[PDB]
What we know:
homodimer, mainly alpha, 2 domains, 2% strand, binds (1~{R})-1-cyclohexyl-2-pyrido[3,4-b]indol-9-yl-ethanol, oxidoreductase (chain B), heme binding (chain B), cytoplasm (chain B)
Amino acid sequence: SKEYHIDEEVGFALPNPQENLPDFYNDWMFIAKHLPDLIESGQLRERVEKLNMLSIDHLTDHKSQRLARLVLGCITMAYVWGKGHGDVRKVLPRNIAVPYCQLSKKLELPPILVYADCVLANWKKKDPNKPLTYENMDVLFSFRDGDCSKGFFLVSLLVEIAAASAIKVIPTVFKAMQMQERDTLLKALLEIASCLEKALQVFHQIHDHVNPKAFFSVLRIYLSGWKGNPQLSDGLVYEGFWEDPKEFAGGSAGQSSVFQCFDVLLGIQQTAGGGHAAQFLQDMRRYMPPAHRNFLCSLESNPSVREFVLSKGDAGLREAYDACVKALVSLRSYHLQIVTKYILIPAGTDLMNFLKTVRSTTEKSLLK
Amino acid sequence: ISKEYHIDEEVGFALPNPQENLPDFYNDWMFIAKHLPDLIESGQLRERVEKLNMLSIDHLTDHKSQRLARLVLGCITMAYVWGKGHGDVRKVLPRNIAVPYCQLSKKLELPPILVYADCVLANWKKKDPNKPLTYENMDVLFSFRDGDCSKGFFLVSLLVEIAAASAIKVIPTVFKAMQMQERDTLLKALLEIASCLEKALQVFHQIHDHVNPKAFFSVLRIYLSGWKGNPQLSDGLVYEGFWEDPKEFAGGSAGQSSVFQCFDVLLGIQQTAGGGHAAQFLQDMRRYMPPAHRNFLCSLESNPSVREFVLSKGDAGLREAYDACVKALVSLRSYHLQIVTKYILIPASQGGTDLMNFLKTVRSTTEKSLL
Ligand code: HEM
Ligand code: HEM
Ligand SMILES: O[C@@H](Cn1c2ccccc2c2ccncc21)C1CCCCC1
Ligand SMILES: O[C@@H](Cn1c2ccccc2c2ccncc21)C1CCCCC1
């Protein structure tokens, strides 16, 4: 569909994002395009404080509003965390905080860098006529030299794209259930598992493009927010826009709509139950684009694919459903091996118990 | 016309014509629920719950019977857990009532605890079927204690839920007028909605006639509170025979009412958006609405914003019509805010003050929505 902003080729990713803002915002674009140098030289916070308050009125369309959210978002994290060694700022200056909050209010997103900014909207094609492959793609913004932010973002983006192939089968699933078309539903579930199995092979590229100590000690710092953070115990002051400081969670892949979408489709009660994992994945929906929030909730309004398969006494239909659940377990299991390489060894123990709980919930959803 | 969603033309989100009696197979359940005041005060409610046999849910054939069974099992559960309402708490719900309550709640996609849709939307009847829906012609189906003001509290909420129903049927007219670009139809629709919300404010005044501040704070409030962030059941309540761990579920609230969230969504009042505790609370309370009412709120959020439509037109008449609805929402919460001060703030001085900071936040969000 169209009002959910789900593309045929890139799915939840923003199709063909905008790389440049109008000349009116050149003072923004220069800072965001040179974050590794302005941070390393100890001049980023000065350049930010010298900016004049630019109006968001010249951001006329959707794509340019998403780019400015990415620009202002990357500068905010660069201003709050600085060099990423402890010298923080608990007040975001109004010349960049007021337009950030105004733009975030308009796009119904929190004023902090989220997954839909630094992954779904932070990419470009090198050559337009060539396909969406890692060698033909690039990110628009980074934080530090050697933060491996290109590999981390683009590999997440590429797994998102690989999962988009399964997203377009979803309407066939619900149509087959309503029309009681058993053979069509089986073929569709097998196709959804096939696409999720291709996405697992895409995931393997993470070792080639992401370095362990680079992600743990650099990129992770600039992606963390100010909710439950001892460094900003009461949040961030959004100067000129809010009286009190506000708390917002740093970016996450719980913000990725892809995995939440198949949890709902297959009846994997991730957001139910009551655990911290349930509440966290539920809260991270507030950090998705509004169109993608509505898509997840619209899947939850449809009849359960799980209860349909359980009620038929159909072996071939339970295996096709199990192939979809199995593909989700395979992804989170391989992803769990990635987190031990990139987080546990460089170190955190709560992340494992969170991921193991999400994976545990998925594996217990199998029928055999 | 709205589909279902389960929204009535006359009573809106309330259950139309609730069932008063379960089949004979469940006579052991109905006897306890119908005699809570005597069984609680005499201290023999918990015994008669424990010597119940584990009845099956298969004999609740239709929707209205399952909603009544959710109402009776919900009232017995609060009575069992809170007892006489003075501190002696049970942390274990016996299996012969825990597993049919959880089985039935699993089927209706609701959590195993009394919610607004139980004790308000499904907890009423007409005294005379032919006479209109007024306070004098209505009555609740269940109460906790004698003098808990549960009749006046449940029916006054129910009456303004009906008063809002007149504005819910105009919602399809609002979105069709935007899609088909009918400016005059939309303006008339927004004015019709604002009028109904102003009709509902007058119904709200009956709260002083039929509710007592001391009876609500010290009696009815105890039986409606739940086991989520509660120092009396810090880990939750164990539903014996169904879950091995204790589970936390929030007490009944009017944040579970769909009418006020429904108009926040329609007017683009970003209540659930933002990071505040009030935004987190109102989103969490949707998990406590009936599934058809959850899906209706979701369906509204998927439609284009009525607010951005009115802002983009440069139309003074359209803005005044949109402002009349926001003004009507501010007037309701403001009057409701003065009710809480008489019924919660003053009895507390012989949650707490967080109830006031919560309601002032949602009112401020509604008030700042003006143009
Ligand atoms: C070096 C690579 C990666 C690291 C270090 C990493 C780390 C983490 C951590 C620590 C979490 C849980 C805490 C939190 O989300 O805040 C998480 C969650 C998640 N990650 Fe990753 N991740 C990596 C790659 C990926 C990729 C490429 C994807 C592609 C879709 C992905 C998908 C997810 C999802 C869906 C979640 C939410 C939890 C779940 O649904 O199981 N991760 N990641
Ligand atoms: C004694 C009379 C009343 C009292 C003491 C009372 C108290 C409260 C309190 C404390 C809250 C927010 C706290 C919470 O639920 O956890 C609340 C919310 C609410 N009440 Fe009431 N209430 C009363 C009557 C009514 C009536 C008649 C209605 C009409 C439906 C109503 C509608 C609501 C709604 C919709 C909310 C959600 C909060 C919001 O407006 O955003 N209340 N009430
Ligand atoms: O890496 C993030 C989690 N996370 C993201 C955060 C922001 C933007 C994207 C992601 C992300 C993307 C894919 N997998 C995990 C992800 C971080 C979460 C807090 C603990 C360290 C790891
Ligand atoms: O007043 C109730 C909230 N509440 C309900 C709870 C259960 C069922 C209905 C209601 C309700 C209905 C209207 N207003 C407030 C309401 C309670 C809120 C939490 C603090 C103690 C007082």
